[PDB]
Structures are given as structure tokens and as C-alpha cells.
Write a structure and sequence with these properties.
homodimer; 328 residues; alpha/beta; Quinone Oxidoreductase, Chain A, domain 1; Rossmann fold; 7-stranded mixed β-sheet; 6-stranded parallel β-sheet; 17 strands; 23% helix
């Protein structure tokens, strides 16, 4: 039994900006609808794919590089078509690292997360109930060591992770301000996403002065997605014993302030915190069913459009988390 | 307290005195004699058997800075790989010896051969180099740390910090004790993929840790004297 398996490949490594033509759709590839006789594997029918900003790095030659001539890979959601592994069976829904294709043979099924809540749209497990949401959870609740009433700044706040960090922070009793690159997004953070305040970093000539304006008594917590001058502007406006969770990130000349302000600047990677996933799924499903958290998805239909969607996200032309629908 | 002042330190003041109005020896922030309105700034010197002068440095603020910065902020473990900038300075020298005593591999940085060669003899450093006869600090640190750096005791900043970040291991730790528009660091994103903790501290928050500290093992740490 053989079926068409369209794929989106990385055409080649790149050094500036990315283009639709750095990827290619191939439609002359096939797949058996069975896992190899003798492996403990699972074959997935892929439903949804996430476009996440860290995927830019994988296109240039210390995470795992993409491979030229092979399917682009990334987080997504699938249905189990066939499984010779004890922990999965036909019809189970899962999320994990999958190919940019219609079908993925998962050789190591233990890298998959079981979706227990098939009653909440499955595309959620590409973001808020996925890697993105789990990033925000561990970055805020763990790395920031927050306390009620503290003063929180989120850069790229309009992005998928930032929006979630801000709502966890508002829910925690913090004062919350956020940064974005367009008026449409600054307004949504206030009107959709519960942020106390928000500005367009591009309307502002002096980021230090801007942050002063929103934080008269200074900043306790910075959720960092950006770096550079924005970081310098935070350090100038940071309070004693403040905390910076470095989730993502030219030059910073401001660091000596870390000494006199007793600042903790710590990087993390969501990949170390998979053990926190079951707790996280429980909390966030509950918030969503309680209608206490808000979430917008940018939905693009068809693999054929995935390259454009990814480049769209890279440029910041998305509004809320960017999702590709492969099928059903 | 009216104190008769015995010893003065020089950092960038601290000293040791005797209580006149008694016989208690103390250390703390002092100015011949000093009137003290607020005396919580004065600590007792609970071992008059050790020479008292040492309470301007190694049994004083300097030593306490090294202690809390290394034992607390760096979270060290035996066998880890430690780099100390300004190693020849009063704090650095002490950090390095706490680290060697803790079982760590220890390398240090200084600005003159007299001090470098001093660090690699008297003060027990495994390695030491002179930052000014080194075109490429990144390459230099690589030379002394083939398997990379777990811990950086930071006194300097700038390009040295960039050089440490390039050479730092996963989950490494930087205790920011001091930093000399300053020079930029262009390297910080490495903090993300390496899961590095970069934390500043000020000894002034840690006066409570002093009793603990005092109970310890048993061109110089320079004490200017005043009396007998």
C-alpha cells in the first residue's frame, strides 16, 4: 500500500534574508502506510505545522542544522496511522518534531507527546499547548522567579511566546508592559491580551526614555526575546535584584549595571524542561476552558503555502501564532 | 563607639579599630580615631590570635566578597573549570585559592609577568596568562581550557567577557563582581544556547554571612598601619 507524500525541502543553506525560493515543494515522493517490519516505530499523518522564529537559525550553517535536499522539520501535530510501539495506537493524536510533509515515520516515538485533550482545537498543540506555550511557562514561572505585584516587561510581546508570558504574568498579579513593531499589534496586547501597556519600539527614538515612561519605579522582570539596544534600555530601567530570562536574542555596553543592581541574566532552552509538560498541559487546558487566557492563530491552508507562511513569520507579517494546515 | 584606628585598607574606607568608649577589636567602615553614630556597620573580630591587619582584606570585606561570590553565586562543584579575571587583585587571588581548595581546575588573568608568574607559584593557580601579550583572548582561553569553562569570576568585562562566553560550557556560571560608553559585548546570545547564568552581586547584601565566613581554613594584600 503506497500513498503520495509531498514534502517541503530546504533547497540550500543560506548566510541575510530568506525567500520562498530557499525551499521547494516536491510531489514525486511516496510512502508505505506501514512502519518497517521490526522497528518499534510510528507512522503519522501530519495535520498541522508550526512556524517558529528559531527555525531561521537552522537555515544557516548550536542547535541542529537543517539538511539541504531534505524535508524541513519542526513542531507539529499528527495522527497515528500505524504503530508497532507499545505506547501508541491507531487514531492517537500527538505532537512533536515532524517533517514538513504529509506523512512522517517517527523512528523514536518516545520524542512524541500524547495529546490527551482532543476536545480543544488540535492546532493549539502547535503553539499554546505546545513548545511555544511550554517556553513561556518555564521562562516565566521558573527562570523569572516572579512574585505578585512585580513589574514585568516583555519584548516581542506580540509574538507567540510573549503574548503568553504576558497573560501568565497578568494572571499572577504582575504589572505588565510589552513591546511590538506595529500599532495594530500594540493595540491587540492591550485589547485582547490583558497587557497594562504597550508601545511600538519603532515609533520611539530613545528606548531608555520610553521604558522610563511606562515604568516610573523601574523594572523587576524582563522576558527577553530580542537583545541589543532593547536590553541596554532595560538595564538602565531595571530595579535592584531584577531578573532577565533570556529566551531569545548587536552590542551591549551596559552590563556593568548588573553588578550595582544585583541583576540575574539567565538563558534557558525549552528542550531541558520536557518533564514540566504534563503539569503545563493541565494548567493551560484549564485556563482555556475557564476562558481566562486568549489566543489567536494565523492559519494558512496547504503545505504548498508553508514556505510563504514561514517567511511571513520571519518578516513579522503574521498576527498571532502562525500555523500551516497540512490536512483534515 | 569612639575607636582607636589600627589598620586601613585601600579598595576602589575599610579598616580595623579598638573600642575606646572597650578593648573589643572591630572591623568596619572607618575614617587616628573615629566617632561612630551608627555601629551596625561594625563587626567583631573574634580571633585576636590571627594578626588584626588581615581584617582589612582576607578576613574583611575583600575576603568576604570572594567567599560569597565563589561559594554562593558560582554554585561550584569539584573538578570544574574556573577562570578568574584580575586574578592578581585582592579578590581574585582569594577566589582562586578557594577554588583550588575546592578541587577545581583554575586559570587566572593579570596585567604583568611579575603578577602572572606570582599567580602560577605562590597562589596556586594551575595556569595564568598576561592579557596584553595575547592578540586573541578567545584563542588564549581555548589554550588553557580545551574542554571549556564552567565558572567565570568576573572583575573586568568587555572583550574578556566575550572571550569567556565563546569558551564557556553548557550550564556555566558567571559571578559579576566588577566590570572595568564602555566596550560592548556582542556575544550574549550564547547565553541562550549554553543556558548560562550571569549574575551580579554586591558584598553589602551579605553581612549576615560573616560569622560563617570568619571560621575559615586558619605587590601584596596592602595594609597601611596606624598604631600598636
Amino acid at each position: 500500500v503506497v500513498v503520495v507524500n509531498k514534502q517541503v525541502l530546504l533547497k540550500h543553506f543560506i548566510p541575510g534574508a530568506p525567500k520562498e525560493t530557499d525551499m521547494e515543494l516536491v510531489t514525486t515522493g511516496t510512502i508505505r502506510l506501514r512502519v518497517p517490519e521490526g522497528s518499534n516505530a510510528v507512522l503519522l499523518k501530519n495535520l498541522y505545522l508550526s512556524c517558529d522564529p528559531y527555525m531561521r537559525m537552522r537555515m544557516t550553517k548550536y542547535v541542529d542544522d537543517f539538511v539541504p535536499g531534505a524535508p524541513i522539520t519542526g513542531f507539529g501535530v499528527g495522527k497515528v496511522v500505524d504503530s508497532s510501539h507499545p505506547d501508541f495506537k491507531t487514531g492517537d493524536y500527538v505532537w512533536g518534531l515532524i517533517g514538513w510533509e504529509e506523512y512522517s515515520l517517527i523512528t523514536k516515538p518516545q520524542g512524541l507527546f500524547k495529546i490527551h485533550h482532543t476536545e480543544i482545537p488540535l492546532s493549539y498543540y502547535t503553539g499554546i499547548l505546545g513548545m511555544v506555550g511550554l517556553t513561556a511557562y518555564v521562562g516565566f514561572y521558573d527562570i523569572c522567579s516572579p512574585k505578585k505585584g512585580e513589574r514585568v516587561f516583555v519584548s516581542a510581546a506580540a509574538g507567540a511566546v510573549g503574548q503568553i508570558v504576558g497573560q501568565f504574568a497578568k494572571q499572577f498579579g504582575c504589572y505588565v508592559v510589552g513591546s511590538a513593531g506595529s500599532d495594530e499589534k500594540v493595540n491587540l496586547l492591550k485589547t485582547k491580551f490583558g497587557f497594562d501597556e504597550a508601545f511600538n519600539y519603532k515609533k520611539e527614538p530613545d528606548l531608555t526614555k520610553a521604558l522610563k515612561r511606562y515604568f516610573p519605579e523601574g523594572i523587576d522582570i524582563y522576558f527577553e526575546n530580542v537583545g541589543g539596544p532593547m536590553l541596554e534600555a532595560v538595564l538602565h530601567n531595571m530595579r535592584i535584584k531584577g531578573r532577565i530570562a533570556a529566551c531569545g536574542m548587536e552590542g551591549v555596553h551596559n552590563l556593568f549595571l548588573i553588578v550595582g543592581k544585583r541583576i540575574r541574566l539567565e538563558g534557558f532552552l525549552v528542550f531541558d524542561h520536557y518533564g514540566s509538560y504534563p503539569e503545563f498541559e493541565e494548567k493551560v487546558v484549564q485556563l482555556i476552558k475557564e476562558e481566562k487566557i486568549k489566543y489567536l492563530e494565523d492559519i494558512v491552508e496547504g503545505l504548498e503555502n508553508a514556505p510563504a507562511a514561514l517567511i511571513g513569520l520571519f518578516e513579522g507579517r503574521n498576527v498571532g501564532k502562525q500555523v500551516v494546515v497540512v490536512s483534515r
